[PDB]
RNA sequence: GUAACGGGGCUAAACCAUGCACCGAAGCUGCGGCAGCGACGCUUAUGCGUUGUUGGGUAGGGGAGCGUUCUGUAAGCCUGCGAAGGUGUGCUGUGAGGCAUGCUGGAGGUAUCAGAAGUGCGAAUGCUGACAUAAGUAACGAUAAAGCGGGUGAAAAGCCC
RNA sequence: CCCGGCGAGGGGAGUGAAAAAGAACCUGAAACCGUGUACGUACAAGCAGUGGGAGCACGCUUAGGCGUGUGACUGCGUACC
């Protein structure tokens, strides 16, 4: 239920070898506004594939 | 002055070939390990491999004394509790006659990473032909 | 020339902030801002403000340009911890540690 | 789980007898060095010329020393041309230790010969403070339930309508 | 003066012998946590060191076959009270 010895700082780093994050590969550029956005997502101004979806 | 020590980047290693027909198993493996390690060289070094490459032919025709051809047993375990398996000398010569020579030499060599490397310089064949003519091996009456 | 920017006594553990700092070490400023913008973590907000401050300091004080700047050095150190009490069962009491962090960013024209 | 030669393997690499070689210990010898106790020379406020022998060690007995704080020697000596302390390097003694010096530091420190002790810590489920481990794990307190629009605001699942 | 939420917290300017003396402030040790550089490490079993020892890197060097750091392989070796 509890440990008999104190793990080391080495064993601690090994367990954290799979805890790293991943950055976004690339951002898509809109056809009309020319803004950077997530693929399959709308822009902050309200554009998506040049159709002027929700503005507010 | 200091004592000479060999260097693995400048040591020479030659090639030889041997015939095992009619030869005694134990008294043959003894001389193989002696040369795979380098005891026959004046540049011998325990922490360096100064041995030579050796090819063995006709492994399926070694000899044994007494009734060892039927009473000698080779044991091994798998890992499960059923486990223990066994095989006789005759049964191994028919299934894989190359393991008889390898198993005997592996026991006469030291243990550890270095001993595992000397074993890699031993090429055993169950016939009379080999495909290492490029290395121009010499005959070794032994 | 190297310009500095720091955020001392931040309300977050160093272990959590270091996960984000490792994504922009050695990258260009323009590329780094885009990464943090689309990173769903609270530490990403703090680091962004620090990076923006350093960029402004270079222009106003050191007279540099944005397009030529790069993140050369970035690290997170531990700060003072605040002690708190947490009641448990059967009269027992445990101690709580609210950890902080010191953030540092360095941008250079080389 | 081979498991009644340590193993590989051996028809001797087994057993009896005889004989000549070699390996083999911190044992003996050789080279260099330190110390203790003895006798001589009676050297001579004793160190040698030398000469023999000894030197594993708990409880415990005997002998000789290092360093720390304080008092006298000191209205002395060193010191802002950089003290104590902190951090490195080099040299040195049989050991506890000592000397010199670079960086930091920014005002006290102390020879020699004597004297006095709150005089040396790894342990006592020791005392106080600080920081690790488990771990970014368990959990976030009744299973009466939430959804949308608008507003404020740097930012609204939780605030206002 | 500038970034920031008329924020917190920082970068310049200036004061001062000194701000790495900035009010969380003289000196600023250790445990503990980090960034950077050199070497080693993904067919190898055990108090993690010791004796031997290649290679790489660096400073020397009148090459002087030395020093410093790392330590493939190998003999021996089951902590303290």
UniProtKB/Swiss-Prot annotation, chain C:
Phenotypic consequence of residue 8 to C: In strain: SK1048; decreases translational rate, tRNA binding and subunit association at 44 degrees Celsius; does not alter 23S rRNA or uL4 interactions; not erythromycin resistant
InterPro entries (UniProt xref): Ribosomal_uL22, Ribosomal_uL22_bac/chlpt-type, Ribosomal_uL22_bac/org-type, Ribosomal_uL22_CS, Ribosomal_uL22_sf
Domain of life according to the entry: Bacteria
One of the GO BP terms on file: response to antibiotic
GO MF annotations in UniProt: large ribosomal subunit rRNA binding; structural constituent of ribosome
Positions contributing to L-tryptophan binding: 90
GO CC terms: cytoplasm; cytosol; cytosolic large ribosomal subunit; large ribosomal subunit
Keywords (A to Z) from UniProt: Antibiotic resistance, Ribonucleoprotein, Ribosomal protein, RNA-binding, rRNA-binding
Further facts: The wild-type allele (erythromycin sensitive) is dominant over the resistant allele, and is also dominant over the temperature-sensitive allele at both low and high temperatures.
Protein family: Belongs to the universal ribosomal protein uL22 family.
Role of this protein: This protein binds specifically to 23S rRNA; its binding is stimulated by other ribosomal proteins, e.g. uL4, bL17, and bL20. It is important during the early stages of 50S assembly. It makes multiple contacts with different domains of the 23S rRNA in the assembled 50S subunit and ribosome.
Subunit-level organization: Part of the 50S ribosomal subunit. In TnaC-stalled ribosomes forms part of the binding pocket for L-Trp with the leader peptide and uL4.
HAMAP family attached to this UniProt entry: Ribosomal_uL22_B
Protein's name in the database: Large ribosomal subunit protein uL22
């Amino acid at each position: 239920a509890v440990q008999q010895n104190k793990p080391t700082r080495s064993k601690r780093g090994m367990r954290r070898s799979h805890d790293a994050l991943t950055a976004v590969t690339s951002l898509s550029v809109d056809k009309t506004s020319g803004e950077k956005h997530l693929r399959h997502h709308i822009t902050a101004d309200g554009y998506y594939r040049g159709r002027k979806v929700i503005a507010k | 002055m200091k004592t000479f020590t060999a260097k693995p980047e400048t040591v020479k290693r030659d090639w030889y070939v041997v015939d095992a027909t009619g030869k005694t198993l134990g008294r043959l493996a003894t001389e193989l390990a002696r040369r795979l390690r380098g005891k026959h060289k004046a540049e011998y070094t325990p922490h360096v491999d100064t041995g030579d490459y050796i090819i063995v032919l006709n492994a399926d025709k070694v000899a044994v004394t007494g009734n060892k051809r039927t009473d000698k047993v080779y044991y091994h375990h798998t890992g499960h509790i059923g486990g223990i398996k066994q095989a006789t000398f005759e049964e191994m010569i028919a299934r894989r006659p190359e393991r008889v020579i390898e198993i005997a030499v592996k026991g006469m060599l030291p243990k550890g990473p270095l001993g595992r490397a000397m074993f890699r310089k031993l090429k055993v064949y169950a016939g009379n032909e080999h495909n290492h003519a490029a290395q121009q091996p010499q005959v070794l009456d032994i | 020339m190297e310009t500095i920017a720091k955020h001392r006594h931040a309300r977050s553990s160093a272990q959590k902030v270091r996960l984000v700092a490792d994504l922009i070490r050695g990258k260009k400023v323009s590329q780094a801002l885009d990464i943090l913008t689309y990173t769903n973590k609270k530490a990403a907000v703090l680091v962004k403000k620090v990076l923006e401050s350093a960029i402004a300091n270079a222009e106003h004080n050191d007279g540099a340009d944005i397009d030529d700047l790069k993140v050369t050095k970035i690290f997170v150190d531990e700060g003072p911890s605040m002690k708190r009490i947490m009641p448990r069962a059967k009269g027992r009491a445990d101690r709580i540690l609210k950890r902080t962090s010191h953030i540092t960013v360095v941008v250079s024209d080389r």
